[PDB]
Ligand binder design. Structure first.
Ligand SMILES: O=c1cc(Br)cc[nH]1
Ligand SMILES: O=c1cc(Br)cc[nH]1
Ligand SMILES: [Cl-]
Length: 130
């Protein structure tokens, strides 16, 4: 229905704004771009399911997210991939991991304060109906 297409558009607008807020934060610059296979040839090796904020924006625009839960799964990937790829005690690794965790925490905190639970519940019920 028109009504359900309105709901999914509202969700895309919501997720675009949250993603843009994360992308413009100087802490999260490393996460805004896919990992360059020159720079890092072994990444696209052991990181099976790469994810970055430009990919998240492309997925919004292609209607791949029907719920905030699906979106947060991709945010969780950005964090768990950073944790997996950069596990060393060296400050370089520790800094990426802290920034990855901060990205994840910020996304969850924005959604906690700004997403209406009844809005998410509606998205979930339309998603399940298909
Ligand atoms: O991401 C957003 C931002 C504003 Br302002 C309003 C709705 N969604
Ligand atoms: O199944 C897998 C594949 C890769 Br690549 C890394 C972890 N687990
Ligand atoms: Cl830096």
């Amino acid at each position: 229905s028109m009504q359900e297409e309105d709901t999914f558009r509202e969700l895309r607008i919501f997720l675009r704004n949250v993603t843009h807020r994360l992308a413009i934060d100087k802490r999260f610059r490393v996460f805004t771009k896919p990992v360059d296979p020159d720079e890092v040839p072994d990444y696209v090796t052991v990181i099976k399911q790469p994810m970055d904020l430009s990919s998240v924006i492309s997925k919004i625009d292609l209607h791949k997210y029907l719920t905030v839960k699906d979106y947060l799964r991709d945010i969780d990937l950005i964090c768990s991939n950073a944790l997996e790829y950069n596990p060393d005690r060296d400050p370089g690794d520790r800094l990426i991991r802290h920034r990855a965790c901060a990205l994840r925490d910020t996304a969850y905190a924005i959604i906690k304060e700004e997403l209406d639970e009844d809005f998410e519940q509606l998205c979930e019920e339309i998603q399940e109906s298909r």
